[PDB]
Design an enzyme around this catalytic site. Sequence first.
Site, short mmCIF file in Angstrom:
data_model
loop_
_atom_site.label_atom_id
_atom_site.label_comp_id
_atom_site.label_asym_id
_atom_site.label_seq_id
_atom_site.Cartn_x
_atom_site.Cartn_y
_atom_site.Cartn_z
N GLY A 245 0.92 -1.14 0.13
CA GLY A 245 0.01 -0.03 -0.02
C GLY A 245 0.85 1.26 0.10
N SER A 246 0.35 2.24 0.76
CA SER A 246 0.97 3.62 0.75
C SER A 246 2.42 3.75 0.85
CB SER A 246 0.53 4.69 1.64
OG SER A 246 -1.16 4.52 1.35
N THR A 247 3.15 2.58 1.70
CA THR A 247 4.49 2.82 1.91
C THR A 247 5.63 2.49 0.49
OG1 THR A 247 4.69 0.09 2.18
CG2 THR A 247 4.34 1.60 4.21
N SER A 301 -1.87 10.27 1.65
CA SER A 301 -1.99 9.22 1.17
C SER A 301 -3.11 9.07 0.24
CB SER A 301 -1.93 8.04 2.18
OG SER A 301 -1.61 6.83 1.44
#
Length: 497
Positions: A245-247, A301
């Site tokens: 995901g956002s990482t 995000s």
Amino acid sequence: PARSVRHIAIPAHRGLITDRNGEPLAVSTPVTTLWANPKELMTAKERWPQLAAALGQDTKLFADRIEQNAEREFIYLVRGLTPEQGEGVIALKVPGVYSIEEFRRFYPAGEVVAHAVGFTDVDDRGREGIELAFDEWLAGVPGKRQVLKDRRGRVIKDVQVTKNAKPGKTLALSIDLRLQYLAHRELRNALLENGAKAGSLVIMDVKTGEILAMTNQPTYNPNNRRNLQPAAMRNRAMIDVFEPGSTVKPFSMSAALASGRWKPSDIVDVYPGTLQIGRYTIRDVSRNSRQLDLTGILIKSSNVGISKIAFDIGAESIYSVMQQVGLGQDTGLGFPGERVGNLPNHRKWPKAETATLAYGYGLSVTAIQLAHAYAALANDGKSVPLSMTRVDRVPDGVQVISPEVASTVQGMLQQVVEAQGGVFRAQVPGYHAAGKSGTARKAYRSLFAGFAPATDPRIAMVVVIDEPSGGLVSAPVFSKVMAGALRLMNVPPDNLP
């Protein structure tokens, strides 16, 4: 035969495993083993019950055990005795009963470094972790000697050593036991506080590729494995695969800034927090925005924001950055059941796949891979191979992101931790920290990936907490362990007046 000349294998002493400072993590200990020769035992039946009772065996099961094997020259009686219960049984002086010191492994740090070090089996061979991965190095070469044996197959004469046993070699891990204790403790306290079932925490040196700490919960005591559970034995950091995901949005941004088409102060309209593409709808976690700059897209995000940038630069540029930082690639560490995850490639990237790659649902990674990717961004765009052993001569490593882009993205991730609306629970008292939360779906995992200090980075870290009771669970864990790691490593503050 009237007599027989026989091979006997001389076991090698297995090499010491230490932490990077020489603290012992696995050590081969003399244990008392009692064995017997049935053929000699059958001539001393009146001794059996006393022998049986000394070994805490039922007289009859023990007698049945000897009778059913009256035709063999060897059986184990009991392995892993202290010298005392060796002499407590040799004291009996039963014909055909012998004491030998075997080497067995002791793990002085126990549950704290279980997954990383692993453990040996009954034959003193690596079964998990470093013990298996460096088994050849640690095992050494067993020796050989010629003996003469009688009718009953007992050693009557030592003829010669034909080959000397070669000792296994010492191995210094990259692990700093002090950081590993701090990480184990802080992760344990996080699961409790957050009500979570499992988790992992990796700490890497961004300059050397060294894994300074790798901790998984739940953990086990490798010195006591009777009540084994594969749940406790699971090396999650190297085995658990998840959509980051956002990482991974900082890698999407790295491709944007390298394209020539984007700068941090550029604006994207993300209103109304959704974007329809064909039959699919991209949806933001928060839907209260119109114009955002690229920093704000990371802080919020916004999947819409990163999708519109991805459509402008193309998925190929993003795929290339993620590939080069190692996402979905072999780590080269050789740990058993290490998973590679998946960075899918296409000739033709439609909008749907382009968007899902950019906001981190179009791939699966391990915590170790993610940590390695953050290390490359933190090391001003230069990737260094992962190592679980102490690095004395640092490899050259590869410039995968231009230092200028890496610097810009570091500054963005600092503002993600520091700016109003940002991940304030990640702030590290002492130092400018940089990083990004995410949630991976399962129920879900809370993720935080980051590094510090933000200006002059030394340490990258990934925190995974599976199914708490999203990413503002992992942020505080990162805050505590990072402050603790930077202090144990005598790193100096970069947030001064």
